[PDB]
């Protein structure tokens, strides 16, 4: 753990939980991530996210 | 390094040179077999243990002012402050 300062090991882990929460919110806010996981048969209101 | 228990220091400064100054520092010592209430600076001296970490060096090399003020190890914990701890 020596090649990075203990300021940096906390700032990576704080950004690891930070970007994870932003990418979750920004995928639900976006309409393009909503689609069907069943492309074989046609639509039966099966629009579903993955995140 | 005196041999007796009595030491006398004088200062003769005349009329035209009253700016001269000196600041000495005596230290009582006993020749070592060093015992309790001794410290043994390693220079033919037993000094009293009140002279150990006194803040002021009393032997030739600071053997008394050594291995003192060794506060606990810290890191990022005490870096939580007005500057870094806000970030
Ligand atoms: C050491 O010096 C102190 C004065 O600072 C004196 O009162 C004391 O008797 C001496 N001896 C011990 C064992 O403290």
């Amino acid at each position: 753990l020596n090649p990075l300062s203990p300021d940096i090991w906390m700032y990576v882990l704080l950004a690891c939980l930070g970007v994870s929460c932003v990418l979750f919110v920004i995928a639900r806010f976006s309409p393009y991530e909503w689609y069907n996981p069943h492309p074989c048969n046609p639509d039966s209101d099966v629009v579903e996210n993955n995140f | 390094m005196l041999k007796t228990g009595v030491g006398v220091i004088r200062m003769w400064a005349d009329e035209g040179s009253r700016l001269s100054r000196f600041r000495m520092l005596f230290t009582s010592f006993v020749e070592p077999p060093c015992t309790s209430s001794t410290f043994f600076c390693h220079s033919n001296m037993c000094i009293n243990n009140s002279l150990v970490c006194n803040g002021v060096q009393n032997c030739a090399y600071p053997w008394d002012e050594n291995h003192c003020k060794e506060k606990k190890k810290a890191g990022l914990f005490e870096q939580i402050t007005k500057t870094h701890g806000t970030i």
Side-chain angles (χ1 to χ4, degrees), chain A residues 14-34 49-51:
Chain A
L14 264 294
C16 183
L17 277 74
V19 177
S20 173
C21 291
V22 172
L23 183 277
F24 177 73
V25 172
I26 210 72
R28 298 291 178 89
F29 183 76
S30 179
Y32 289 98
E33 289 293 328
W34 292 95
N49 214 171
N50 297 115
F51 291 100

Side-chain angles (χ1 to χ4, degrees), chain A residues 4-20:
Chain A
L4 292 175
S5 177
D7 291 331
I8 302 299
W9 291 108
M10 293 301 291
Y11 288 165
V12 170
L13 196 151
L14 264 294
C16 183
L17 277 74
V19 177
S20 173

